[PDB]
Amino acid sequence: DNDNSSARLFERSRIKALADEREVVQKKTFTKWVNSHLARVSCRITDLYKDLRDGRMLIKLLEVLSGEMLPKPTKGKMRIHCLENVDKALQFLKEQRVHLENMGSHDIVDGNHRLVLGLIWTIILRFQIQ
Amino acid sequence: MAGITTIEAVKRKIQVLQQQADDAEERAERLQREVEGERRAREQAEAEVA
Amino acid sequence: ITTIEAVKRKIQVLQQQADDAEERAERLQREVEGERRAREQAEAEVA
Amino acid sequence: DEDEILGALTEEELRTLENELDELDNALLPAGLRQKDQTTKAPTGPFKREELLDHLEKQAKEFKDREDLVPYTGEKRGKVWVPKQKPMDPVLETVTLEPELEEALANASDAELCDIAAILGMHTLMSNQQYYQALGSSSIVNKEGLNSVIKPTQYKPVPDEEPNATDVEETLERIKNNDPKLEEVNLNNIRNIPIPTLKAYAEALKENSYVKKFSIVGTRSNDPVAFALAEMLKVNKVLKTLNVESNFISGAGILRLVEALPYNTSLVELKIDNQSQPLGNKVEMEIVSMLEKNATLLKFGYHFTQQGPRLRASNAMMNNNDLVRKRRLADLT
Amino acid sequence: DDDIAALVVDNGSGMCKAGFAGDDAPRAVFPSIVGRPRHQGVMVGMGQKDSYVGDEAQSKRGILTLKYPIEHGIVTNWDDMEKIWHHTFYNELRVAPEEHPVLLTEAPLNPKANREKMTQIMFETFNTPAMYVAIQAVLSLYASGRTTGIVMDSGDGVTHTVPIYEGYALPHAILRLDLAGRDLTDYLMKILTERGYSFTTTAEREIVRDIKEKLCYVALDFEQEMATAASSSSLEKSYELPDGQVITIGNERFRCPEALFQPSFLGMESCGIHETTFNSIMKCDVDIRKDLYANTVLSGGTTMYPGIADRMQKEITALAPSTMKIKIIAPPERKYSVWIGGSILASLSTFQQMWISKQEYDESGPSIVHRKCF
Amino acid sequence: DDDIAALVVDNGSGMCKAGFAGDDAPRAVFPSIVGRPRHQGVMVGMGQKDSYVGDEAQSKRGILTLKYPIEHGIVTNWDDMEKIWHHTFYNELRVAPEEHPVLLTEAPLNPKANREKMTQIMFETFNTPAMYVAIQAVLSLYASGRTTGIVMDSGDGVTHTVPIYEGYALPHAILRLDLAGRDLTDYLMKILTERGYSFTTTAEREIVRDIKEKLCYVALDFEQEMATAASSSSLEKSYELPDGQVITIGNERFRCPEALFQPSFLGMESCGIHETTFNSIMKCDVDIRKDLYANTVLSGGTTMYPGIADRMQKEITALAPSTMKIKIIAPPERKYSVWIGGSILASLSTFQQMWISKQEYDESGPSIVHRKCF
Amino acid sequence: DDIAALVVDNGSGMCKAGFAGDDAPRAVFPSIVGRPRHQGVMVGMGQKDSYVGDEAQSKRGILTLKYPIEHGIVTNWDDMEKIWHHTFYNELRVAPEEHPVLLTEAPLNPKANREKMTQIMFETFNTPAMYVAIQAVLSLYASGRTTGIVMDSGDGVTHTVPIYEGYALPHAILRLDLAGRDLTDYLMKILTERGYSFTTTAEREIVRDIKEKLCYVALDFEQEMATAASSSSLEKSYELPDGQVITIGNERFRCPEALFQPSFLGMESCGIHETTFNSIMKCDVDIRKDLYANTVLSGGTTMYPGIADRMQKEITALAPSTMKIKIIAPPERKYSVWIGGSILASLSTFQQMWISKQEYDESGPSIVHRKCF
Ligand SMILES: Nc1ncnc2c1ncn2[C@@H]1O[C@H](COP(=O)(O)OP(=O)(O)O)[C@@H](O)[C@H]1O
């Protein structure tokens, strides 16, 4: 099975490396952008995957970007309140014409890199600073 | 409906059953007359077109 | 040998006669449709 | 405000919390010992019950009466639902098909009425068995009626079987004596057989060369009996069939039984069906894997929950029976 | 040797039906249930016997636990099958199986070891001189009397559809769906809970099965029947339990067979029987479909609910093109059709060439069943 | 600011809890018992205000009969429910039911009249503005903080196991076993009568229940425990009675909870709780089984036996495949966690859509609970 | 420099995407759309209606899984729009309004399919340019030779085309509908024989994984059947996701043998070797000698271990003796249909091939037949 081994070999190496380098530089750019936009309020993001997990950072980012008021985030340490906090930001995005695919609150909560990077990219592209 | 009689409902069903049988009989005679007329018309048209 | 068994036999005979009647009727209907389908084109060809 | 929350709690509770965190329950101690004792007083008395009853009664009598703030009167303080009524369907038409057929069905009994009700198509009105015997033949068979209630099948009574007349001590004594005219030992469904007595049977059958079949079905046997039988099977060369169905043998005991199979080549049928608890799939895997080792056993009665071990056990039984067929064929020609 | 008449045995999941060849009806019909002692205490009524087989087990439900040897058409317990076959041969037909040939039935898509173990067990423990294994849905078409049509069988363990055109079966179009009377019984227990009644043990399972066999019917329109049942109590009927109290099922009499048409009630994502039959028809060639629409044949004990024929015809007429003509052939004796065609199959003169001899088994082992049978 | 939120009322089979939403602990904890004068009219009709409720009922154990209005999760007597509910609203919580929404719990597979009757009592007697009915097992999964796992809940009347994967419930795999702590109380009385201490009436019921709560434990190995108890007396403990007499339990400490695992002692044809969990897991799909192995959650007051978790882990690992891992979550506060689940679920901002307000009840009646809830 | 175009390969089983000029795709994910089955009792969870791509494969138990593409034809278009949206915005994080798009199509299929893709990509995604190319032409590009016959096999369609010196022969193009999904269904039907039951859509993924791991093409079929019947050395063990252990055994090589004998599935068509030989024989006499030595395999379905030796043996049996047969099977052939596409968008003259936005606006969605082959 040398040809199958070489196919798995190419799959393990080139696709993964070419995706990883793009993902790394994209997340490094996105961290700079969200830190520049969140610096007006007393907030800072040190890790893109972990700080956006909880949900307060995202709702504050939508607060500052929209310039317009959002409902009270629910207070609580468990997972369910975190799901609520992500879901409210997702609903706010659902109102202002932004179209999202494969987006669930538990996807952001669990910490999928692809979906959080796509959400930030969609925020940059389709949402209006206004 | 709380008040009903089994005899009456059975009797209505018998009425509907004979109506169905009669309807199918006019259907059969209906269609036999139709097919004979169409066959004769087709034959006459074929002869004169030939 | 009484009237009720005669009633049951009568309605059963009527029912199966009716079923055979719709079977023959629908088969004849489809044959009629085919014959008319054939004849109309012959008239147009005559014209 | 963690410090303020901890200060809001009692200081004795804080010391108790420190002690409890140092103790963390009692995972090291066994299950029995981890509970604390209630009181330090020694047991006294043969438990005279009437003193308990009288003490409880006077305790109930000399109790200060809690007075509730609001008495209960069963007052309904909310709006009643008052369900809506429908105008329904007030239609009335007479069909009047035939003066002959009016009087024909006017005086018919309900039992004969249901036949013409079913032949016209009201299957919902009566039971299905009734509905089908109505359509079975061109005569009135229906006796029950559409309104009447349905009753279950009675089947047929079974005569009582005579209880087990096989005595215990004389049978064991004859087994120990190597009796030539004792070949079948039946112990099915016998009240209160002692476990050491069953073990004594197990070592008694070690040296018996005249009993071919054994059965202890429904004897409430347990794991020591299984261990003793597993020890016995290696020595014995005459026993054909062992039956241990309907017992309290655990999975480990059954594992000990199947582990004796490679050593002996005299057992052909073993039944372990209907045990109190499921054996588990690991025990099943061991059973089938090293039952594939044995080549003598032909019949094995067990219902496997998994599909893999069941398939492999069926294949092993097929192989053993096919070996019997092949040696017969080779002996013929 | 015309005195030697073969035995026709159908081993269904719920009931076993045995009889002599050349007869219109099976002689013995009895459920295949093995009863074993409970663990709460010793029994009252039996001594040296280890278990009860057949109607004797069915009568003594209160002291026995009941097990089915056939699970979804698969023999899980082979010793239980030996007990069932021994009871059939010695206690019901009262004949020695050494002198008679045996004909057996089987579901289409089975483990391949089923036929091999069946043949080996029969030949070794009963010494029959000849035997044969046939497939149930071909026997149904033999019983119906035509050589062209689709057979949709629904027993107590499995449902299967097979098409046949002029006696050639199409193996790539055979569909097997796991939906039978046992799942309907379990769903009936689950939908009888909310009225108040509770059924747990195996005797309760037999009671619920007896209720289902006599009280359930298939609604023509589900929503219209639901509205009718919510409107009034016209559909309600009463049943008498063996204890003495009377229950009233009411609405759920037509909710139990609806799982046959909507499997999502049971949580499975499969399709209904109508969709299965339509898919089985679409798997065949374009030319023969016109015959297969005209000769849909129902069978099995599960299709004994009234109103199933009109509902299935309505559903298939919805699915099929409008030009095509659909009729459903539901014989009134269909519950035993799988047996009846077997009595035909053992009567044919060509079939005497098709038996599996004792000698042929002796050289070829139990693998002769694959080469000799379909 | 919605009239200090709703009230969470966990009305268990043997003991009721009540409190405010958003609080970790219930405000009121008291048994669900109605005590009546037994047979006499002595001492100027002693036993006045004949319904004694809660702690006052257990105070006068000798002169009263104690009746449980909830048996096996089903309301036998409705007047006693509304008396208990009046006691909760007015005598202990001291809040008006007119301005506070009410949250209620119930068993999963219960007769359908219970929901309608609870809705009728809430809206017609105490005229609450909004009300909702949930399931104890879902509340336990809420309290555990996980959105994936299998939940066992065993109270004084019912045991039920439900699986939930990613917030999606599987209704076909929900089980209900009718083996609870009351049966263990009766078995404890049965084995205590053999030793010599005969306990008959309701005061004896409370005493035996107290003995069981204070001195019972689940043995890891039953036969080893039997050998240890027969060999020595180190496992023996002493319990003093309220009057002063002291008795010894001894062998009866671990035989009482063993009926949870072997129902043959109780005289019931049923499987153990571990078999119920394993069968509920096998009834799910292939892929989501592994997570259900790794997120087993225990709940209810019955699970406060010492050593139940390790024993049931040993049993499950005996049944489960050896490749993956088995763990059991047993919080020390689990007896109250059902109520805690309500304190979470009424606290959510999205739950305000799910309230059954009075305006819809005034148009739909008590049947709206079938559409609004579950 | 100009903006690099996006190479997007829409297969029946997997979807691949990347940038032109790269040697490997940057995003590979299954083309599956799943929808919830049961009911949700937890309030406050996610309310997403459709799982797409790898996220649908992550949670199989509570989903019914569907394929928007079957047999090389798009049957559901909303699911295709979801697939393309997840490919563009999430897997690559690119703006489609500034990138030309290259697409991949089977040779023979319904015509209207092409129009629909064009009508989608100019309207919903507003691309400035797009193009559609056949799979096997791109495979021949990635092979590195101008002259050869290309046999491609995926999950939806098998097709053989001959090309001589860059000239294609349209009458010799052959298409067969036996592909990977048919092999998966046949493996399910043949695994029923051992007692194992798989029925749901989630279990089809399990069966597909078993087929990918444990199937090989036997060089000789009857000899392999005799060997597998005589001994049990051919058996292998697989572990189910719930810890069960199954044994495949004789079913390892019977499933791929269906590629060469289609009578196992009830199809009366010929095998892949017969299809290749017939496609060679339809060509002219002169160009056959170059076509016999330049046979190229492609697609994931041709990744069974031992397919090349069997194909060479059968074609050598059919072909005359004086000609020599060479089967070219590159080790990375699964992505060849992508790789040649990444070559094709990097050429200088391909900038003259694009269907511009203005041309579509002028001549409607039917322009794709005039430009694309
Ligand atoms: N009169 C009846 N009405 C409805 N269902 C019935 C009736 N009699 C039997 N059944 C169903 O048919 C099943 C028995 O089917 P059977 O013919 O034994 O299947 P098999 O093909 O396995 O032999 C029973 O479990 C029962 O549910």
Ligand SMILES: Nc1ncnc2c1ncn2[C@@H]1O[C@H](COP(=O)(O)OP(=O)(O)O)[C@@H](O)[C@H]1O
């Ligand atoms: N400390 C304890 N140790 C052992 N068992 C206990 C303990 N406390 C309570 N129990 C058991 O729990 C039961 C009470 O369960 P409970 O939580 O009231 O059920 P419900 O869910 O109906 O409220 C009692 O019958 C008792 O046997």
Ligand SMILES: Nc1ncnc2c1ncn2[C@@H]1O[C@H](COP(=O)(O)OP(=O)(O)O)[C@@H](O)[C@H]1O
């Ligand atoms: N290593 C492998 N061995 C055997 N077959 C494989 C292997 N990898 C993939 N396959 C088969 O190839 C199919 C995937 O082909 P793919 O290249 O995705 O087709 P397309 O992309 O054209 O739709 C899978 O369904 C599988 O059956």
